[PDB]
């Protein structure tokens, strides 16, 4: 069943990987949001027109 | 470590392998022989004291 | 009707041998990647 | 001896970074944070405090602050170069331009040079890096290296910060809006320039 | 090792606006096609 | 809150110019009577005030006050160039004992130029101007211009006090001992200063 191990092996990381991205995206997004957030008070409020 | 970098490295190069072991007097002849056989099976170089 | 849909959408693809090769390489690394993430 | 708020600001843990780096010609923005995050709290106090050294912490309608020494400035004066103002204006456009927001503020020297050469005139620009240049690619490379060095000097003077692991990629301060001092209002750029030199904010080189 | 694999394979995918449009059009027709077969 | 006496010191009308010069890097010797006395009175607070910048307000054994930047100096540092270092040692060597027999405290650019040329090795002089040059008059003129530039640079730091005219004659302040070695009882100033210059 060594080959099964390789699947039993691989499928774990994939799963973890999915979960990892599941969090990572938010970690990126929440950061990006703040940039957008800062932008509104660092680009337009000073250049309203 | 090596397996991960297997893709980036061309197969023409097999990276140098070298570890250490101080106070080898702790080991028994069986353990030392097993270490030597494992290392050479893994093309592993050793520096033992 | 979909003709103008596409026309005003504007999209394209372009894979020279080297680019397509780089693509398979990135794909294989991702399949090998710990967390699927690829740093530049 | 001092008002409560001014002594408060001078007592803030961030205050020494602010004071020292402003004396060293660094300027206030979203980056250069330690000199901005609380100076937003005591702008008037720091300005009246700095007036004692015959220097003014000036804020335009923009949210950036920067130091300007008087003619009788106690801390001695100096100026920057034309190419510095150039890279600065390009950086200001990048800072304002929402299209590159996806960059999240991180930008590379190649992007900077591309935008600069796109907006500006290559040869008339290059006249100033070296007076004799006539479209030689050696002078173009010289200009690119000079852009790199001016970016470094602007980093020293609080306009840009190299990433901890990358000197090729950088994040921009809001002090970049200093470079838009001739465009912060709808008045003529030359009359505004006269008002800057009057307020010692800018001078021709 | 896969580098030469790709190199000697020699492949490419690309699509101007008109070609990509023609592609969606053929795809839609196939989705509408009686037997999925598309005659020239 | 803030220490009350530190508030008193910073509110002092002499605080602005003293602080500005200290940021510049200029030392404050005993010759600056008002600055020196103010520093002596309010050192206990000004040391903390500047250490907040990670800069140490050090009173030398000679008594002059100066800002020693730490590695983490919140005021980004500039430094005296190589020619500045050797011209500063030559200045101290122009302030040490032997100058009393030659210039009585008032020196000229010619004295410093001659001492630099005679004492300093030709190799370091060429390093200052250029390695390929060899004694040429134009290279000497460039070296003299650099000497004037570094002399003014030392002037900004309160290490040399110019006599008020365009002619390049001046006196040297005690703070110049930051360049030279620390004097010990029984040591020949000439010997130690020459060993350091060598």
Q: How many helices (H) and strands (E) does chain B have?
A: 1, 2
What is d(CA F176, CA F181) in angstroms, rounded to the nearest whole number? Answer: 10
D40's tokens: 């937003």
Assess whether the region F1-69 and the region F82-180 belong to the same CATH fold: yes
F130's tokens: 């250029």
CB of F112 closer than 8 Å to CB of F106: no
F14's tokens: 């002499």
Give every CB contact of residue D166 below 8 A, 6+ residues apart in sequence: none
Q: Does F70 touch chain D (CB under 8 A)?
A: no
Q: Which residues of F touch D15 (CB under 8 A)?
A: 52
The sheet with strand F107-108 has its strands ordered as F107-108, F169-172, F160-162
Instruction: Tell me how crowded residue F117 is: count the other CB atoms within 10 A of its CB.
Output: 12
Instruction: Tell me how crowded residue D92 is: count the other CB atoms within 10 A of its CB.
Output: 23
Q: Which of F189, F175, F159 is nearest to F59 (CA)?
A: F175
Q: What backbone phi and psi angles, to 5 degrees, belong to D40?
A: -60, -25
Task: Kindly state the DSSP code that residue D99 receives in the 8-state scheme.
Answer: G
Q: Containing H/E element for F97?
A: none
Q: What backbone phi and psi angles, to 5 degrees, belong to F28?
A: -125, 100
Half-sphere exposure of D37 (CA within 13 A, CB side): 10
**CB F75 to CB D23 under 8 A?**
yes
Domain boundaries F82-180, CATH class? mainly alpha
Give every CB contact of residue B37 below 8 A, 6+ residues apart in sequence: none
Q: What angle do CA D95, D101, D107 make, to 5 degrees?
A: 65
Q: Which of D16, D35, D152 to mutate to probe the F interface, most F CBs <10 Å?
A: D16
Q: Does A46 touch chain D (CB under 8 A)?
A: yes
The CA R_g of chain F, rounded to the nearest whole Å, is 19
Q: What angle do CA F44, F45, F46 make, to 5 degrees?
A: 100
Cα separations in angstroms, D121 against D19, D86, D117, D118:
38, 11, 6, 8
D31's tokens: 């980056």
Helix axis angle for D137-156 and D82-96, nearest 10°, is 70
Q: Which residues of E touch C10 (CB under 8 A)?
A: 17
Domain boundaries, chain D: 1-69, 82-180
* DSSP-assigned letters across all residues of D29-75: SSSSGGGTTTTTTSHHHHHHHHHTTTEEEEE-SSS-EEEEE-TT-SS
Nearest to D53 among F7, F20, F74 (CB): F20
3-state SS class at F66: strand
Q: Resolution in angstroms, to 1 decimal, for this deposition?
A: 13.0
Task: Kindly state the DSSP code that residue B28 receives in the 8-state scheme.
Answer: -
The CA R_g of chain A, rounded to the nearest whole Å, is 21
**CB C6 to CB E17 under 8 A?**
yes
**CB B4 to CB C32 under 8 A?**
yes
β-bridge mates for residue F161, sequence order: F171
**CB A42 to CB D105 under 8 A?**
no
What is d(CA B30, CA F106) in angstroms, rounded to the nearest whole number? Answer: 86
Domain boundaries D1-69, CATH class? mainly alpha
3-state SS class at C40: coil
3-state secondary structure F112-171: HHHHHHHHCCHHHHHHHHCCCCCCCHHHHHHHHHHHHHHHHHHHHCCCEEECCCCCCEEE
Give every CB contact of residue F153 below 8 A, 6+ residues apart in sequence: F80, F84
Q: Does C28 touch chain B (CB under 8 A)?
A: yes
């Amino acid at each position: 069943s060594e080959l099964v191990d390789k699947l039993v092996f691989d499928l774990q990381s994939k799963l973890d990987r999915i979960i990892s991205w599941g969090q990572q995206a938010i970690d990126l997004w929440i950061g990006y949001d703040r940039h957008v957030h800062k932008f509104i008070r660092t680009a337009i409020d000073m250049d309203k027109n | 470590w090596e397996e991960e970098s297997r893709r980036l490295r061309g197969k023409d190069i097999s990276p140098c392998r070298l570890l250490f072991l101080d106070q080898a007097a702790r080991l028994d002849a069986k353990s030392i022989a097993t270490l030597f056989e494992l290392c050479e099976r893994l093309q592993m170089q050793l520096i033992i004291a | 009707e979909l003709v103008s849909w596409a026309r005003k959408n504007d999209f394209s693809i372009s894979l020279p041998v080297e680019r397509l090769a780089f693509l398979m390489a990135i794909a294989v690394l991702n399949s090998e990647r710990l967390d699927g993430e690829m740093s530049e | 001896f001092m008002p409560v708020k001014l002594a408060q600001a001078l007592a803030n843990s961030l205050f020494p970074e602010l004071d020292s780096q402003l004396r060293a010609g660094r300027h206030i923005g979203i980056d250069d944070l330690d000199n901005h995050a609380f100076l937003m709290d005591f702008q008037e106090q720091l300005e009246e405090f700095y007036a004692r050294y015959n220097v003014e912490l000036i804020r335009a309608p923009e949210g950036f602050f920067y130091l300007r020494p008087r003619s009788t400035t106690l801390i001695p004066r100096s100026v920057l170069s034309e190419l510095d103002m150039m890279v600065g204006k390009i950086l200001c456009y990048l800072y304002l331009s929402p299209e590159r927001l996806a960059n999240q503020g991180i930008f590379t020297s190649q992007e900077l040079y591309e935008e600069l050469i796109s907006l500006a005139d290559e040869g008339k620009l290059m006249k100033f890096v070296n007076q004799r240049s006539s479209g030689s690619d050696l002078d173009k490379q010289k200009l690119q290296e000079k852009v790199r060095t001016t970016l470094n000097r602007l980093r020293r003077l609080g306009m840009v910060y190299f990433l901890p692991n990358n000197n090729n990629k950088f994040t921009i301060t809001e002090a970049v809006f200093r470079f838009g001092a001739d465009v912060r209002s709808g008045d003529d750029p030359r009359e505004i320039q006269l008002r800057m030199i009057r307020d010692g904010e800018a001078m021709p080189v």
